[PDB]
Amino acid sequence: AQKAPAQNSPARFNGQAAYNLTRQYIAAAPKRWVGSPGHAKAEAFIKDHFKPEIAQGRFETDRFTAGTPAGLLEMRNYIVRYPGKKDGVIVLATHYETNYPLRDINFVGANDGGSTTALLIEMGNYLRAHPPQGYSIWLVFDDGEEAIQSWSATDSLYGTRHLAAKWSQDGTLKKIKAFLLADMIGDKDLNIDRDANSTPWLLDMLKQAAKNTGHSAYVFKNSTAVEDDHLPFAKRGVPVLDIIDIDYGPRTFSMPDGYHHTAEDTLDKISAHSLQIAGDLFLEMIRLINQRG
Ligand code: NA
Ligand SMILES: [Zn+2]
């Protein structure tokens, strides 16, 4: 006996739409540090792109007061739910704000936050049109990922430390099959680093997803270990994967970290081709996680 084979293939992710959304997000809210009017415009942009989910009761605002070196700061995570047909949740996440210490330069985070906020908005468009047939998919737009003063275990990851604690306390973490973080994947010169902090079965699955989507040339050139929004989940036993390109721009004596955290992180540094690859990988990861069961 056997299942009847499916006669239709899934719709493809729209990378050009994700690129256009990045341009629109940067136009609407170029500087987005916590507390600023630009941050509020960024939040309005996200909400304006999830009106159906808001009307359906599938959009959550998770507001909290963070203790930071700059004092008490209000932060807001946003969670958009696409319920599936079986119990269990795949979370896709991105940060959406820009660095507070960079508030007085023209830092707009086009790749760093912008491209992945757009990626997940486009994922919402995709999932609204093509509802998930396996696990639920939840989209997380997290606040306060970047250090308020200087990166450390206490000054970073405010939104995900809060969200991981909230979901631990209420039992939600038990349901998470995988937490998939998108970070800095609009880079015109794209290669996803192999993050040793990510869960091995998810790293192996991303290598398989790249094979399946014809994108092996873009995955795992460099091996490293990344401190990012997946750590508060990983430290509580949640399977995590950081789909990140941390090698952003040419490293030189004067720019030892390339375009990362400089005013050169602009829209001319990202491409629809890279966002297409990223979205293809995310959709294939969802299929493979569903298959793993
Ligand atoms: Na790169
Ligand atoms: Zn950053």
Q: Which of 227, 290, 286 is nearest to 92 (CA)?
A: 286
Would you say 142 and 96 are in contact if contact means Cβ atoms under 8 Å apart?
A: yes
> Resolution, rounded to a tenth of an Å?
1.3
Domain ranges (residues) in the chain: 1-293
Distance (Å) from CA 213 to ligand 2 centroid: 28
- Give the Cα separation of 143 and 157 in Å (integer): 8
Q: Please report which ligand is nearest the Cα atom of 146.
A: 2
Q: Please report which ligand is nearest the Cα atom of 229.
A: 2
Tell me which method was used to determine the 3D structure: X-ray
Distance (Å) from CA 269 to ligand 2 centroid: 15
Distance (Å) from CA 191 to ligand 1 centroid: 5
Distance (Å) from CA 27 to ligand 1 centroid: 23
Residue 112 annotated in ligand binding = yes
| Residue where the block lists tokens 């998919």 | 137
Would you say 14 and 122 are in contact if contact means Cβ atoms under 8 Å apart?
A: yes
Would you say 54 and 78 are in contact if contact means Cβ atoms under 8 Å apart?
A: no
| DSSP for 152-221, written as a single string | SSSSS-HHHHHHHHHHHHTTGGGGEEEEEEEESTTBSS--EEEETTS-HHHHHHHHHHHHHHT-GGGEEE
